[PDB]
Design a protein around this ligand. Structure first.
Ligand SMILES: CC(=O)N[C@H]1[C@H]([C@H](O)[C@H](O)CO)O[C@@](O[C@H]2[C@@H](O)[C@@H](CO)O[C@@H](O[C@H]3[C@H](O)[C@@H](O)[C@H](SCC(=N)NCCCC[C@H](NC(C)=O)C(N)=O)O[C@@H]3CO)[C@@H]2O)(C(=O)O)C[C@@H]1O
Lengths: 213, 219
């Protein structure tokens, strides 16, 4: 019944820059506002409570301020470890509510992907299915296009991709694209290729194997 | 202070969930314990609380289906929810303010999936390193963890001793309705003949643990 709006929904900052996260309550919540840091694959951790109290063990670069309906989390000079989702919440009145979160992502120099390709294991083939995996390792920025070609036929609708959360120690991403075929279809073709388009590449790069080897 | 939760699992719609939160380092007769959940790709949602004195307060949008209870002598708090819908799928946390004004202590989370599908343990296939997964003095290898339900799985390498260079990708739901993910690691290409690489897969919903040795590819 009290609504917390966080802005922006995502941002990208360079290391050492000042970060400002905003949270706006739909009604006066006085100072009953907390900020939480959630790193991937972890529980939220308390950073600030009572709008401005820094919680135990939190680095001094995190500061909370604000009151009534407008609240701010600042990171005085952001570090690569500070990559996370940041949540604000109010505990002024029932029901307690939270904002939708702000994703903090880091900026770095453009980094092209290393591209690797993996044919299906022989154990999987015996089961009747074939997964071919294309890996894009340690690149930046996040945007990349992967296209599969089978005996030069451009594929569509038979692949899925996943992208890691940004790495906290080099600020890069990795991406896996998986092409799935029946074993019968896999065995009807020779060349399996993935072609990668990325800001860090002159021209699209292709990685391929031939089953006939 | 510690809050430890029971494990992830699957429940059918219209059925009911039950989660246990076991607390240590404080007493339930002195601190209230809350439950908060995070639905997929959404923010946190406060569910309710059982105070030290034993009274409860609930999120009014859900209170008809929610119950929070505790056993002081056993240091356990219980969340129960019935008439479940698909959109009750979420990471469920217990938490406490302790002595503070916000959620200062959190459990590790319990992933509850609401679905009519059955639990299925994963198939684990090697992503064998080859001339095709080598870039100079760096080779990549991995394991494909395929056809499991529900989330989550944990993937480690060499029982967890190997963490540098490891990327475990978020799972994707396949058109079959099962999940699939990969986990990869980059190693020195000269290490492929001298170092053992084993991926360890744990799927607690099916109480499955699998280890796959990943060897370089043959001819
Ligand atoms: C170590 C210790 O001191 N233990 C205490 C614990 C402990 O402090 C907590 O568990 C936190 O860890 O608290 C005990 O007391 C509880 C208990 O008394 C329950 C009963 O319901 O209430 C708990 O207090 C909460 C209030 O119920 C809740 O209303 C507030 S909301 C924040 C707020 N201060 N808002 C002010 C105005 C509210 C809006 C208002 N509307 C109205 C007035 O209707 C308006 N003007 O619009 O949060 C309180 C907690 O922060 C209380 O803590 C316990 O757990 O039993 C006692 C134990 O000794």
């Amino acid at each position: 019944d009290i609504q917390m709006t966080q802005s922006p929904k995502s941002m990208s900052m360079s290391v050492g820059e000042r970060v400002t996260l905003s949270c706006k309550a739909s009604e006066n919540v006085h100072t009953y506002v907390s900020w939480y840091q959630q790193k991937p694959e972890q529980s939220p951790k308390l950073l600030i409570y009572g709008a401005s109290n820094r919680y135990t063990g939190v680095p001094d670069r995190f500061t909370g301020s604000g009151s009534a309906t407008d609240f701010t989390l600042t990171i005085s000079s952001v570090q690569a470890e500070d990559l996370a989702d940041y949540h604000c919440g109010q505990t002024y009145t029932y029901p307690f509510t939270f904002g939708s979160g702000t994703k903090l992502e880091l900026k770095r120099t453009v980094a092209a992907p290393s591209v690797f390709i993996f044919p299906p294991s022989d154990e999987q083939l015996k089961s009747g299915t074939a997964s071919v995996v294309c890996l894009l390792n340690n690149f930046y920025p996040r945007e990349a296009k992967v296209q599969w070609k089978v005996d030069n036929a451009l594929q569509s609708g038979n692949s899925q991709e996943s992208v890691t959360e940004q790495d906290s120690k080099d600020s890069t991403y990795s991406l896996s694209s998986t092409l799935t075929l029946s074993k019968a279809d896999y065995e009807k073709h020779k060349v399996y290729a993935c072609e990668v388009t990325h800001q860090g590449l002159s021209s699209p790069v292709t990685k391929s194997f031939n089953r006939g080897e | 202070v510690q809050l430890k939760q029971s494990g992830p699992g699957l429940v059918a719609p219209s059925q009911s969930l039950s989660i246990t939160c076991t607390v240590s380092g404080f007493s339930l007769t002195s601190f209230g314990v809350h439950w908060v959940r995070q639905p997929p790709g959404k923010g946190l949602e406060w569910l309710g609380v059982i105070w030290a004195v034993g009274s409860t307060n609930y999120n009014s949008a859900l209170m008809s289906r929610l119950s929070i209870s505790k056993d002081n002598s056993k240091s356990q708090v219980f969340l129960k929810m019935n008439s479940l819908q698909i959109d009750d799928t979420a990471m469920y946390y217990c938490a406490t303010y302790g002595n503070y004004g916000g959620f200062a202590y959190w459990g590790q989370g319990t992933l509850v999936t609401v679905s009519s599908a059955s639990t299925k343990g994963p198939s684990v296939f090697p992503l064998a390193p080859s001339s095709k997964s080598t870039s100079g003095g760096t080779a990549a290898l991995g394991c494909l963890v395929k056809d499991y339900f529900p989330e989550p799985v944990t993937v480690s390498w060499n029982s967890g001793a190997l963490t540098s260079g490891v990327h475990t990708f978020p799972a994707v739901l396949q058109s079959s309705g099962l999940y699939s993910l990969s986990s990869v690691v980059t190693v020195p290409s000269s290490s492929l003949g001298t170092q053992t690489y084993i991926c360890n897969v744990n799927h607690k919903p099916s109480n499955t643990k699998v280890d796959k040795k990943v060897e370089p590819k043959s001819c």
